[PDB]
Amino acid sequence: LYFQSNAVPSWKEAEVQTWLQQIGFSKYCESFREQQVDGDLLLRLTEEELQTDLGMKSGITRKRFFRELTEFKTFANYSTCDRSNLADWLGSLDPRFRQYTYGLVSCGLDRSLLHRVSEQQLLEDCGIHLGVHRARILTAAREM
Amino acid sequence: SNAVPSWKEAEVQTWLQQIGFSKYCESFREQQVDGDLLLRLTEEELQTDLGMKSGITRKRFFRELTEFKTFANYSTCDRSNLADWLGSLDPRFRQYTYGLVSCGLDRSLLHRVSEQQLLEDCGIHLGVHRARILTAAREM
Amino acid sequence: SNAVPSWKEAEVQTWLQQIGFSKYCESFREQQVDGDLLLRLTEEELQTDLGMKSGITRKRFFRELTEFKTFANYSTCDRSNLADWLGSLDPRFRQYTYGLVSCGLDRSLLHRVSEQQLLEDCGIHLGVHRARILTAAREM
Amino acid sequence: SNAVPSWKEAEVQTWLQQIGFSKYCESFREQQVDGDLLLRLTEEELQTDLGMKSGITRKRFFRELTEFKTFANYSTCDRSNLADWLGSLDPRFRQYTYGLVSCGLDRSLLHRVSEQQLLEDCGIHLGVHRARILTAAREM
Amino acid sequence: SNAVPSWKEAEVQTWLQQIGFSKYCESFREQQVDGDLLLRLTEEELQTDLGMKSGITRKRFFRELTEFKTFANYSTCDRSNLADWLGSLDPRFRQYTYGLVSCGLDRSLLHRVSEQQLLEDCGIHLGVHRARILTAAREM
């Protein structure tokens, strides 16, 4: 086990700034601070925000960025905002599914409400883009 | 104060400073934004009419505004206490109070509202929120 | 006066000054806006033909105009008193009086109007209002 | 002369002067607008071919034209007296006479006309008017 | 001198002069417009290839052409006397003769025609005309 500044939802701008340096994206440090990107905004970043508001011109560079961010979201501490422990429920299906925790929690979802979620809600509201991931989370939510 | 519907332009000016958006004070006052207009601000108005170019800055602004909508005093315009009905489902649902009352809705009329009206008229964009408010309203 | 349908350009000019929109006086007289045109003003005419560029400023304008439409004298054109029928249902619904009477509608013909007609012909944009006016019309 | 269908370009020119639209006399004359073309004038033709840029000014024009169309002499072209049948439902409906007469319609053929035809062929844009004319035509 | 299908360029040139369209004489001869092309002229061909920019002027042009098509001699190409079948329904329906004959249609084939064919192939744009011609054809 380890000690880590790991609670991404609680991150302020300084934590995001250090993280960009840690992943080799120090080129965008000034851009992330002028936009005042904190933990909550980082977890809700869209490609449009990355491209237009943060200036990440290359689609490959954006793929690299989101590849790093997805890695960190998978191993993030969500305890400050996940009272139902939605993270460990997603992890029980697949460790890779922990990345969706903040998306589900930001919509006010929890274990008790999962059985009524739809595919459109998982895509538009929670931002689960991969249909394979949506389908497995969906069928698991309805089988309870 | 917290009775946002009754806010005048001066209160909106004070609130923008408290949330770190003092750069946009002059533009909000040139547009004469009061409590009612602040509660009905759309992304297009923020971007074009108020000059908030960045979509991230707009996300920050609406994140602050959504917090205040959750803990606002709506007593001056909410005769049926729609706010505590929304809060009984989820505290975050109180933010939709002004949207629901501006359409003339109240507890007596809620069971007949549609998903389409909740999205186009009341401005509830998240489908999880629309669907939950919808099912709860019909169980009346 | 209070009879907005009967207003001439001079009354519209005085009304714009009284509501703090004297900035748009010259534009409203160039377009020769009288009472009938004011009550049928669309957002497109406001923006393009009258030069009200800001969507927030237009929202303020229609908020004032909605108030005066709610408390207007329609005696010269509302023989069936559709205004007080709409007002008895919901105070804000009285603003729609001129939209319905300009289409030749009245109490006797109201029950056969559709939601499409209320939106396209009479200009009732809020779907909640359209549904309530319609449902009440059928209960006659 | 009150028989608009029989109007020549000179009559249209005099009529524009009587309604305060003499500014557009020269445009109407180079476009050779006579009575028949005036009664079939569309908004797009007004805007592009006649140069009436403002939507409010176009609304005033059609407001005058609709008034004249309601109290017009159709004896030269209305073999079935469709005008007084339309007027018997609502005086406002005489304005549609030339639209129906231009399509070769008459009292005998009204019962088989559709709402799509009244809108696309005859140019009756208001759905409330279309619905009343249809229900009355099919019920005679 | 009314057998439009047989017209050469010289006949079209004089007709344009007779109807006050001498402005477009040279354009019609550079395009080598003869009787057959004139009877099949589209609005797009008028606007783009013949330079008739104004939509009102094109409406005026087609108003003259439609009048002439109504009183034309089609004997050289109408074996089935489709003109008098259309004329027995309505004198104005004779204008559609060349549209029906150019598609290889005749009385024997009419009962099998659809509305889409009358619109797209034969060029009967008015739905009231299409619907009457259609129902009469099926009652054979």
Next chain:
Amino acid sequence: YFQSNAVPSWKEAEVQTWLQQIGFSKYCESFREQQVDGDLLLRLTEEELQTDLGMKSGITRKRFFRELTEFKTFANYSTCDRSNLADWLGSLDPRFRQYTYGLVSCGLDRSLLHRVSEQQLLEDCGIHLGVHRARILTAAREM
């Protein structure tokens, strides 16, 4: 005027003389720069006429296709129509012989006609008039 009516076999020289016979000698040079032979002439589209051959006017194109349609009606298709689809089309309407090359270029013949669809007649064979498509379609099924 002198010409083999077997249009499918035409070479570039035949197309050149044919363009002159119909008064389109202005477009001869463009037709030879594009190397239009009998097969290409019978498959010319409005797009090719406008862009590749430079016939800007839609009326001039209508005039051209009016000339071309007449020759297509009275052409010799014997070199490529083993099933004699031409006289089958002619039995419905003489003007329907114009569609012969369109039908044979798609590999159609009498034996396959009963299974052809409306979409195939429009997209593949190029029969644009719906009245013609509908009559040819119903007639093929009556076999």
Next chain:
Amino acid sequence: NAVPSWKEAEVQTWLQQIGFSKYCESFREQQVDGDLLLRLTEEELQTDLGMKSGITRKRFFRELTEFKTFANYSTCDRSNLADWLGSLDPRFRQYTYGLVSCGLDRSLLHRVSEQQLLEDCGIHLGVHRARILTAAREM
């Protein structure tokens, strides 16, 4: 003869033999070999190879269709799909490389759909698609 096996040199000689020596330089800068020639699309012809005229492209594909019809596919058509397609209609043998490039053969042909023949194998004519399919189903 074995078009699938052609290298750039064979394509260069073929362009000269069909009178398209004007496009040798563009075909050589794009390094068109046999496999690319058999999969050439009109978009590639126009944009990447510079054949601006749609009529010239139609002429080119008319020559290419000729050679695809009479090509030796032995190096890549183990199921001899070519002579099966040609036996239905000579016009159909040109499609051989399109079907074998998708891993198709006689045994799997009956399982192909009309949409697949158009999108995957590139058989544009609907009349050809329908005939090849119904014959495959009667196999």
Next chain:
Amino acid sequence: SNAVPSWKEAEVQTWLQQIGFSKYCESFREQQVDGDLLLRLTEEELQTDLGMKSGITRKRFFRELTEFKTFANYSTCDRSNLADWLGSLDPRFRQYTYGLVSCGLDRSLLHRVSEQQLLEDCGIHLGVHRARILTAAREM
């Protein structure tokens, strides 16, 4: 090293030289393309971000890349040995291994995959391949 998924930028640089695409080394290095990104390269990324404008050159590139993907070492990332399951149906199908493995798929989950998912998520564009993989996966 044949294990393309574990490749670093240096391996991708060496691979581009071996396949004759050393022209694009500088662009692939400026974009920091490693093994994982190379196996997920799209047509748009090749064109816009890597500067391979010619569609034929891109077709050549993907022809080489598909070859290496078919005979690649997936032991570091293919826990279910999806590669040899795909290869047993058709050797060409090993090329899809990383597409399915990147979506968290394995042998146990294949029977529930849809054609839409194979195309949108895993990037299997040929419908014939999609149909064969599905039918075989469901026959388990």
